[PDB]
Design a binder for this molecule. Sequence first.
Ligand SMILES: O=C1CN(Cc2ccccc2)CC(=O)N1
Length: 185
Amino acid sequence: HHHHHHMVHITLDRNTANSWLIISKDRRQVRMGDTHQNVSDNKERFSNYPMVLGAQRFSSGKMYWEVDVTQKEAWDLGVCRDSVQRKGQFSLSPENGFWTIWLWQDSYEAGTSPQTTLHIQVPPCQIGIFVDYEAGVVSFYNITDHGSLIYTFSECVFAGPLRPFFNVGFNYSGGNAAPLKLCPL
Ligand SMILES: O=C1CN(Cc2ccccc2)CC(=O)N1
């Protein structure tokens, strides 16, 4: 791909984070904490899952960023509407305002409803995410495999401002403690 020149500097929004997440000082890394991280509750925080939003809101244009997923067993990545549900149980789907892919139990899937199997020969250590607002496109790229395409959501109905979306996943196994990191431009 040749989307690198639309690179944007993403930072994480503390206020949206599940209360167990630890966001680095530079707001570029996030990981699962051992316990509750001693923050007050608020209506923005994702309550049920280890999720956080980027601070940036996009309503036009083309945007690109990259995320490091090295040594994780489980995670979700993509974009979502600013108005997505924060509290309780929900599925990641375009009907609920999410355009995402994930790793879970040694398989990669796109967050369609129902979910779509992805075909990845080279497990990625870094993921590229491209959003074309006007075109209604969200695409995912395997940076470890020379930028190969993972998945394209087309005919997207964003229906609002978009925010970068992250889920570090649970760490029931003791093998998923590693952070998500926003990679430098
Ligand atoms: O990885 C974990 C975290 N988990 C707490 C938790 C629940 C809901 C949302 C965020 C955090 C408990 C557990 O058993 N392991």
